[PDB]
Design a protein around this nucleic acid. Structure first.
Ligand SMILES: Cc1cn([C@H]2C[C@H](O)[C@@H](COP(=O)(O)OP(=O)(O)OP(=O)(O)O)O2)c(=O)[nH]c1=O
Ligand code: SF4
Ligand SMILES: [Zn+2]
Lengths: 1010, 66
DNA sequence: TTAAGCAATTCGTAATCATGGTCATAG
DNA sequence: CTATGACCATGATTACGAATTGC
């Protein structure tokens, strides 16, 4: 629809180009100037034109040591290494490499690993023509033949085999989303006859570019173009949609320029004639071929930078591609920027111990960038459900019906289009509100990796990139060590608690950035690790090296500076600047998203240390990891000895303090005073006192005062939070307990939060007992919503769940009769509830889908929920304040309240009536019993105040759907399984149905036909 | 039949007769006739040549827990 | 060709081991 | 018609894997 502005008057012999790049690309090419791999770079100007840039003359290489013989110091054998062996038996050694310009170069460099000296050594630099020839050469120089005139006897290892685009960016100092400049007279626009579809197309040599480091005025962001879209399909009853039978009926698109607070384009393409919508364009077609063609032409002409959505990768784009393949439309799958290239669906998997394992499809688009917001949420955030409704409530606050809204009239289709446009608008709001893209651009500028790697890869490519960028400045080469496999080492210490309930303030002192500052201030690195022999026979121990608790020796900083101290120092300053910016916000959600930014930079700095100990990886050095955790243990026991030893009764102070807890970075010391001001004063004195026994940047700091405190086990405690004194209290802290885990029911987590509220804030155990009694009583009397009963568990890799029978695996692998095409896959979460049956050996035989127990009305196992979900967390919490008469107090609270329980063949009812007063079954329909007949005015009085309260609950719920829907004049259709509103509006109809019929036992209060 | 099942499905979604997914089909036909909006005399003449069948004398979504 | 670490607590299922109610037949 | 231990049946203890959170 709307086009980019027109590039007026660029003349290359006088004017430069200044543009900001988004994507890079590799390309094997003809039309050479009179190398074959030429590079592509796509970007945008400071105004809004689209620029493609072709870069020429770059070829991959690596290094290898020159062996000590008469060969690789003699030029005849250098060019003979270039020369091929013409023998017949060298077909395995000069064919797959063959005649390639590997070349011969002599340079003086060093290896990374260890500390041998300040002296370098000769290495050979071996270029290669193509990037897809470094793999057979590696298969032909190490295990292949290297008998060539006795120049290089096998073997010499390969060093610095890295990726092509990463080697380019390490070479020329270009980072992700960078400002690039072509100077005047260096670039030719009309040398390249147009093979792509951008406006400006330059054709430059790889030594002409200028990279501007992002800082000062070069810290801006260009006006990018962002698209979001959503589709609709018309299915059958029960049957989930399939790309060979179910047509695509509506596509809806939103588009904006980045930096402007509203969109500028709003389009909706439908398949029958429709009705107009104010604010958007509407076009209609009588066939699906025209609809797919129209969308492909719009996406070529608008030419967006970024494409977003929600689950567009695994649902939307391959559905469109398969549907275009079935209907024989040849011109659809050309969505990219290159004019002669069609797109294809390709599977990929990712797995780690940090995010688990996920299997995704990818679809190829060259030039353009994809950001599915579902994958960003699934990677960064740990939530309970990952539906669009659930995250839109958590962050903002909100198939067979559609097939008859489309086979109807045109106002129904207009309603369908407004629904689809709201769906297509929600991920834009989430992208701009959560500060996604600004943090992605800052991550790519601090680490130096492209913008497509932050959605596909892990935390290794970034630390490899930063280490290579720091390695070119002193002249070192990296080695290739690979081992399967070493052993584990010893991790962190935890101090033994003094368990219980405390009501005198405890002050928390901890170290900030512990492991990066250990690695900084004792000069630990790959490049300064001293081997056990190379100290000998030199004898200089003092101020030349140090010794660690695991046992290594490491050189002092008066000889070398390591590489990991400098990378860590850069990351630490970036996080410090993020916190300094975060210290001046007032909005809460903005404060937590800047907390998210600084959390991400601290995770990056700690993954630098975790790179060293990963024995399945790219470069492990477990000696360093052992030295780190040994220093950690030594320093925390130093802290505990010092804190408990100095402030004592004989040293003039009030009370000898005693440490109650410590977990590898923090110390919770109990001081003795019950005044929060005096505890805060002595705690600040203690933190600042103890910090002066270390190198720098090692510092201990005061952080909080808990008052009161509740310590249950290791990694399980709770307390109340004081930041200042006249800032009285902030909130609770629930470390580890049953309120922050997601393996349980909402009922149990709510009861634990409410019990700690009534028990820590108001200090009333009697209201707490009465609360827990009411929860158990309302459980047994069958008046608890089934939202509070849903359990969710993650469906991981299928073989570990083959090894032992679980409940959620049994529910998932059991398909439905309605739909063998929508079922949980690997990596998602399965929700279930437990119904009552008589198979007590197996709780995996009583699990059912919440919607299935909704539509089929199966009962609930209240004894399962009473003794297996609720009871034992309560016995954790309520015991330490009292004795074991407290277990008997809650099991007796239960006992006064356990005696109140509410209740094929089911069709053959008799429906025996019963007396309302004393429950005696009898013949006739009158409500009262003959012995309890007098007391009837009181028994009518009783239960009409129950009908009165059910009437008041019907009306508050069924008009809330009208305000959440938007309209007051049309029907509600919302079966949202993540809304408490749904199925709480279903049971009050039946309560009212039952309670209205019980009062017609009594006669009518008058006539009605008068 | 199979042509009489689309006439009723077309009467059920025309907005000028009312917002009807809680009641029967013949009750909505007589409600519009009282106010006399314009009920057509064909959605009546198939609700008379049938008995109490639940796929003629019921709204489209008379399943569906809404 | 691809993947940052360790410590600790909780719950469910099958298997191992203890103990009583019938029973079957020798006295 | 009546003792005795062999036989079936039901409940208490231990072991180990899976899931998830704290540093
Ligand atoms: C959270 C976390 C901690 N650690 C280690 C490194 C840390 O130095 C040590 C302390 O944990 P943390 O206190 O969580 O982190 P931190 O001390 O480095 O930073 P800050 O005080 O500002 O919050 O625990 C990891 O190795 N990986 C991790 O993911
Ligand atoms: S059931 Fe009602 S309140 Fe709940 S999400 Fe649906 S429309 Fe909104
Ligand atoms: Zn009675």
């Amino acid at each position: 629809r709307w086009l980019r502005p027109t590039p007026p008057a660029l003349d290359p012999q006088t004017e430069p180009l200044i543009f900001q790049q988004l994507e890079i690309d590799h390309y094997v090419g003809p039309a050479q100037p009179v190398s074959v791999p030429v590079l592509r770079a796509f970007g945008v100007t400071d105004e809004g034109f689209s620029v493609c840039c072709h870069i020429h003359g770059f070829a991959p290489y690596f290094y290898t040591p020159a062996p000590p013989g008469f060969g690789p110091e003699h030029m005849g054998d250098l060019q003979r290494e270039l020369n091929l062996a013409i023998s017949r038996d060298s077909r395995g050694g000069r064919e797959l490499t063959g005649p390639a310009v590997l070349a011969v170069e002599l340079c003086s460099r060093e290896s990374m690993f260890g500390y041998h000296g300040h002296g370098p050594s000769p290495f050979l630099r071996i270029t290669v023509a193509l990037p897809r020839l470094v793999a057979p050469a590696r298969r032909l120089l190490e295990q292949g033949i290297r008998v060539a005139g006795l120049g290089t006897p096998s073997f010499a290892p390969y060093e610095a085999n890295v990726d092509f685009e990463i080697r380019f960016m390490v070479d020329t100092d270009i980072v992700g989303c960078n400002w690039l400049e072509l100077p005047a007279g260096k670039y030719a626009l009309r040398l390249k006859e147009k093979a792509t579809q951008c406006q400006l197309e330059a054709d430059v040599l790889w030594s002409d570019v200028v990279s501007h480091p992002p800082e000062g005025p070069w810290q801006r962001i260009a006006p990018l173009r962002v698209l979001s879209f959503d589709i609709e399909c018309a299915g059958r009853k029960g049957i989930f949609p399939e790309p060979e039978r179910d047509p695509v009926i509506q596509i809806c698109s939103l588009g904006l320029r980045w930096g402007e607070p509203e969109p500028f384009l709003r389009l909706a393409l439908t398949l029958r004639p429709c009705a107009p919508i104010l604010g958007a364009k509407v076009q209609s077609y009588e066939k699906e071929e025209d609809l797919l063609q129209a969308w492909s032409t719009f996406i070529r002409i608008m030419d967006p930078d970024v494409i977003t959505g929600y689950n567009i990768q695994n649902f939307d784009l391959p559905y469109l591609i398969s549907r275009a393949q079935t209907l024989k439309v040849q011109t659809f799958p050309f969505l990219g920027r290159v004019a002669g290239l069609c797109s294809n669906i390709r599977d990929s998997s990712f797995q780690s111990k940090q995010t688990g394992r996920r299997d995704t499809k990818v679809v190829s688009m060259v030039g353009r960038v994809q950001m599915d917001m579902l994958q960003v949420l699934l990677r960064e955030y740990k939530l309970r459900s990952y539906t669009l409704n659930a995250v839109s409530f958590h962050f903002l606050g909100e198939h067979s019906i559609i097939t008859d809204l489309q086979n109807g009239n045109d106002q129904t289709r207009r309603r369908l289009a407004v629904y689809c446009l709201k769906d297509a608008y929600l991920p834009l709001r989430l992208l701009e509100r959560l500060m996604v893209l600004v943090n992605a651009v800052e991550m790519a500028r601090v680490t130096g990796v492209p913008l497509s790697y932050l959605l596909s890869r892990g935390q290794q490519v970034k630390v490899v990139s930063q280490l290579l960028r720091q390695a070119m400045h002193e002249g070192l080469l990296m080695p290739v060590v690979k081992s399967e496999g070493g052993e584990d080492y010893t991790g962190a210490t935890v101090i033994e608690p003094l368990k219980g309930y405390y009501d005198v303030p405890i002050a928390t002192l901890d170290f900030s950035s512990l492991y990066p500052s250990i690695m900084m201030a004792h000069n630990l690195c790959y490049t300064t690790l001293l081997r056990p022999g190379t100290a000998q026979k030199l004898g200089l121990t003092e101020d030349q090296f140090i010794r660690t608790p695991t046992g290594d020796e490491f050189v002092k900083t008066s000889v070398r500076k390591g590489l990991l101290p400098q990378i860590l120092e850069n990351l630490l300053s970036a996080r410090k600047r993020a916190k300094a910016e975060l210290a001046k916000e007032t909005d809460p959600l903005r404060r937590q998203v800047l907390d998210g930014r600084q959390l991400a930079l601290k995770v990056s700095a700690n993954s630098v240390y975790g790179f060293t100990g990963a024995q399945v990886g790219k470069l492990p050095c477990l000696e360093i990891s052992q030295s780190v955790t040994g220093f950690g243990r030594q320093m925390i026991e130093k802290t505990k000895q010092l804190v408990e030893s100095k402030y004592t009764v004989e040293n003039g102070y009030s009370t000898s303090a005693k440490v109650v807890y410590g977990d590898t970075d923090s110390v919770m010391c109990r001081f003795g005073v019950s005044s929060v001001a005096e505890a805060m004063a002595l705690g600040r004195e203690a933190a600042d006192w103890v910090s002066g026994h270390f190198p720098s940047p090692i510092r201990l700091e005061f952080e909080k005062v808990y008052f009161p405190y509740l310590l249950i086990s290791k990694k399980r405690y709770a307390g109340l939070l004081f930041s200042s004194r006249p800032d009285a209290h902030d909130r609770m802290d629930c470390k580890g307990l049953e309120a922050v885990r997601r393996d349980n029911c909402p009922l149990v987590a709510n009861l634990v939060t409410a019990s700690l509220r009534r028990l820590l804030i108001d200090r009333d155990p009697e209201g707490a007992v009465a609360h827990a009694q009411d929860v158990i009583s309302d459980l047994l009397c069958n008046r608890i919503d089934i939202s509070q009963l849903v359990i969710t568990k993650e469906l991981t890799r299928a073989a570990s769940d083959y090894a032992g029978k679980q409940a959620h695996v049994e529910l998932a692998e059991r398909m439905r009769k309605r739909d063998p095409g929508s079922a949980p896959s690997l990596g998602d979460r399965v929700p279930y509830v437990i119904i009552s049956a008589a198979k007590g050996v197996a709780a995996y035989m009583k699990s059912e889908d919440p919607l299935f127990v909704l539509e089929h009305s199966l009962p609930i196992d209240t004894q399962y929920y009473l003794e297996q979900q609720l009871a034992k967390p309560l016995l954790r919490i309520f015991e330490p304040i009292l004795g074991e008469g407290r277990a008997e107090a809650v099991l007796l609270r239960g006992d006064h309240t356990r005696c109140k329980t509410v209740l094929g063949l089911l069709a053959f009812a008799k429906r025996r009536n019963c007396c309302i007063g004393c429950r005696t079954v009898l013949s006739h329909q009158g409500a009262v019993c003959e012995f309890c007949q007098p007391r009837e005015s009181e028994l009518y009085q009783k239960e009409v105040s129950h009908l009165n309260a059910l009437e008041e609950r019907f009306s508050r719920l069924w008009t809330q759907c009208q305000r959440c829907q938007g309209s007051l004049h049309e029907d509600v259709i919302c079966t949202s399984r993540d809304c408490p509103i749904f199925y709480m509006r279903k049971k009050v109809r039946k309560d009212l149905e039952d309670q209205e019929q019980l009062l017609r036992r009594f006669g009518p209060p008058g006539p009605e036909a008068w | 039949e199979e042509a009489e099942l689309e006439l009723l499905r077309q009467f059920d979604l025309a907005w000028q007769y009312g917002p009807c997914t809680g009641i029967t089909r013949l009750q909505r036909w007589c409600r519009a006739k009282q106010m006399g909006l314009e009920p057509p005399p064909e959605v009546w003449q198939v609700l008379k040549t049938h008995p109490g069948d639940p796929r003629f004398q019921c709204s489209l979504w008379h399943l569906y827990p809404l």
